[PDB]
Scaffold this motif. Structure first.
Motif, PDB file in Angstrom:
ATOM      1  N   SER A 141       0.835  -1.272  -0.010  1.00 16.23           N
ATOM      2  CA  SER A 141      -0.038  -0.094   0.194  1.00 16.23           C
ATOM      3  C   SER A 141       0.947   1.256  -0.081  1.00 16.23           C
ATOM      4  O   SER A 141       0.229   2.312  -0.132  1.00 16.23           O
ATOM      5  N   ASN A 142       1.973   1.146   0.341  1.00 13.98           N
ATOM      6  CA  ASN A 142       3.040   2.319   0.263  1.00 13.98           C
ATOM      7  C   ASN A 142       3.773   2.501  -1.276  1.00 13.98           C
ATOM      8  O   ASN A 142       4.558   1.480  -1.608  1.00 13.98           O
ATOM      9  N   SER A 143       3.886   3.564  -1.650  1.00 15.00           N
ATOM     10  CA  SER A 143       4.103   3.763  -3.256  1.00 15.00           C
ATOM     11  C   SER A 143       5.795   3.544  -3.180  1.00 15.00           C
ATOM     12  O   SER A 143       6.094   3.163  -4.287  1.00 15.00           O
ATOM     13  N   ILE A 144       6.377   4.240  -2.184  1.00 21.47           N
ATOM     14  CA  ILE A 144       7.712   3.903  -2.008  1.00 21.47           C
ATOM     15  C   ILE A 144       8.138   2.665  -1.813  1.00 21.47           C
ATOM     16  O   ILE A 144       9.244   2.444  -2.424  1.00 21.47           O
ATOM     17  N   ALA A 145       7.644   1.974  -0.854  1.00 20.18           N
ATOM     18  CA  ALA A 145       7.907   0.707  -0.350  1.00 20.18           C
ATOM     19  C   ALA A 145       7.788  -0.186  -1.636  1.00 20.18           C
ATOM     20  O   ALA A 145       8.401  -1.280  -1.833  1.00 20.18           O
ATOM     21  N   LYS A 146       6.709   0.036  -2.361  1.00 19.36           N
ATOM     22  CA  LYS A 146       6.322  -0.620  -3.571  1.00 19.36           C
ATOM     23  C   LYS A 146       7.326  -0.704  -4.649  1.00 19.36           C
ATOM     24  O   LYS A 146       7.676  -1.975  -5.076  1.00 19.36           O
ATOM     25  N   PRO A 199       8.817  -4.893  -4.580  1.00 24.35           N
ATOM     26  CA  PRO A 199       7.589  -5.116  -5.113  1.00 24.35           C
ATOM     27  C   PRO A 199       6.899  -6.043  -4.577  1.00 24.35           C
ATOM     28  O   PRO A 199       5.657  -6.401  -4.137  1.00 24.35           O
ATOM     29  N   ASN A 200       7.872  -7.199  -4.591  1.00 26.46           N
ATOM     30  CA  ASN A 200       7.367  -8.507  -3.712  1.00 26.46           C
ATOM     31  C   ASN A 200       7.534  -8.647  -2.228  1.00 26.46           C
ATOM     32  O   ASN A 200       7.576  -9.768  -1.714  1.00 26.46           O
ATOM     33  N   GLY A 201       7.547  -7.461  -1.670  1.00 29.37           N
ATOM     34  CA  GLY A 201       8.063  -7.499  -0.158  1.00 29.37           C
ATOM     35  C   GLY A 201       6.794  -7.839   0.680  1.00 29.37           C
ATOM     36  O   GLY A 201       5.425  -7.624   0.377  1.00 29.37           O
ATOM     37  N   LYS A 202       7.138  -8.681   1.727  1.00 32.05           N
ATOM     38  CA  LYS A 202       6.137  -8.956   2.689  1.00 32.05           C
ATOM     39  C   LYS A 202       6.172  -7.822   3.616  1.00 32.05           C
ATOM     40  O   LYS A 202       7.202  -7.486   4.125  1.00 32.05           O
TER      41      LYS A 202
END
Length: 290
Positions: A222-227, A231-234
């Protein structure tokens, strides 16, 4: 003396190393947000870029006039410097505390334990004693060893354990009267609901808290920077504000994960165009008692 606090890892990376991560734009957007306002104390993490961080700190100085320097930058402005403070590392520790109420004492401690990529950081914790209504309350802000894919399994977890023991040892040795609350908060890099989480409560000497709002603080879903970054992040829940379990407790401490987003902002580089709509790759946490 109880407090409303926010802790936020603001992702203010070096603008030399990462010239196009919107650091300055976000320092302004953070200053304009609702979540940073109307608290007593704010803990920042990853305030690394000197210019962007100094601008963030100035953007909140009107409401929070009492401010620490940023951990590990210099020995100036501190009542005491301790731990492995080095003049020769490339990056400061990125931790700062600001307050609406006078800061009576401020101490920086650069962690003795580490690896890694964090070797070249004055990472550690900042201690403040703050006076509210003629009485004292204490706030420690910190940012511990990240889950590093190069440092061992394994080793990151052991690094965090010792770093947390550095904090709880400091608290004990300070002999703070037990009728005064000691908050300890920041990006602690231990995921909720894991075996390591139980270790953190022991090593930090803290009680667990009640939780509200979002169920993760670093969230590629849901976070655009973390995304972008993973992208495949838990999603994980890594940021907390706790209090020492042997000192006065708040009425009923809550940590709320805030998902406020700024107006969309862009980076034109240069090459690629991208739009984001978050303050940081972490979500802030608000702590308080209802």
């Amino acid at each position: 003396t109880d407090l409303k606090l926010v802790s936020h890892n603001v992702y203010m990376l070096s603008t030399v190393l990462y010239p196009n991560w919107g650091q300055y734009k976000r320092a302004d957007l953070i200053g304009q947000s609702s979540y940073i306002k109307n608290n007593d104390v704010v803990i920042f993490n990853e305030a690394f870029d000197n210019g962007a961080s100094d601008k963030l700190l100035s953007n909140v100085k009107k409401e929070y006039p009492y401010q620490t320097p940023v951990l590990g930058r210099s020995q100036s402005g501190w009542d005491k410097t301790e731990g492995s403070y080095s003049s020769t590392v490339a990056e400061d520790g990125g931790v700062a505390i600001v307050s609406k109420y006078p800061i009576k004492e401020k101490i920086q401690h650069v962690f003795k334990s580490g690896c890694g990529f964090d070797n070249d950081s004055n990472k550690g914790f900042v201690y403040t004693k703050i006076e509210k209504n003629g009485k004292n309350v204490h706030v420690i802000g910190t940012h511990t060893q990240s889950e590093d894919s190069r440092c061992g399994a394994g080793h990151d977890r052991k690094i965090r354990a010792e770093q947390m023991k550095e904090i709880s040892d400091f608290v004990k040795k300070k002999n703070i009267p037990k009728d005064e609350t000691v908050y300890i908060g920041g990006d602690l890099n231990v995921n909720k609901g894991t075996p390591e989480f139980k270790d953190m409560l022991k090593n930090l000497n803290v009680n667990d808290v009640l939780y509200a709002g979002h169920n993760s603080t670093w969230d590629p879903q849901s976070n655009s920077i973390a995304k972008y970054n993973y992208p495949n992040g838990k999603p994980e829940h890594l940021d907390y504000i706790f209090t020492d379990k042997d000192h006065k407790q708040p009425k009923q401490l809550v940590n709320e994960v805030v998902t406020e987003k700024p107006k969309p902002w862009d980076v034109y580089a240069a090459a690629y165009y991208y739009v984001y709509n978050d303050f940081s790759d972490h979500y802030p946490i608000k702590a308080y008692s209802k």
